[PDB]
C-alpha cells in the first residue's frame, strides 16, 4: 500500500507502507477552531479520535491524498 | 492469496492480496496487558513485531482468520 505521508519535516511525499500497515489516513487535526493541520501517512489500523478531529481512513493506494 | 483482512474503518473482509503479497497475517496488537486489537490482512512479509505482540503468518488462503 502508498499511501500520501506528510513528510517528518514538512511537506508530502508517497510511501510504501511497511508490511502489516494497510491503512492510509488523513487526518484533520484541529488546533483552534478555525486552524488545522493535515497528517496523513500509514497505520496499522485507522488511529483513534477521541478529540473529534475528522479522520479518513481507507485501505487503497493514495487514497487519503 | 485471499486473507482475512480488517476493514480500514473496522470489521472484517476477505481481500486478495495485491500481486507480490503472499503472506496472511493476523497480529493480536496489546494495547494494555490486557486488552487488545486483532489485525488481519495481506502483506508483503510477515511484519516486524517488537513489542511482543503474538502474531501469526502463514500463506495459505484465510489462514489468518
Known amino acids: 500500500l502508498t499511501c500520501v505521508t506528510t513528510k517528518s519535516i514538512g511537506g508530502?511525499?508517497?510511501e510504501?507502507?511497511?508490511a502489516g500497515q494497510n491503512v492510509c489516513f488523513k487526518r484533520?487535526?484541529?488546533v483552534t477552531p478555525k486552524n488545522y493541520d493535515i497528517?496523513?501517512?500509514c497505520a496499522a489500523t485507522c488511529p483513534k479520535v477521541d478529540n473529534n478531529d475528522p479522520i479518513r481512513c481507507?485501505?487503497?493506494d493514495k487514497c487519503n491524498d
Request: hydrophobic share 20%; aromatic share 14%; proline share 7%.
Open 12 to 14: 508530502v511525499t508517497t
Open 16 to 18: 510504501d507502507c511497511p
Open 28 to 30: 484533520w487535526h484541529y
Open 39 to 41: 497528517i496523513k501517512g
Open 58 to 60: 481507507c485501505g487503497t
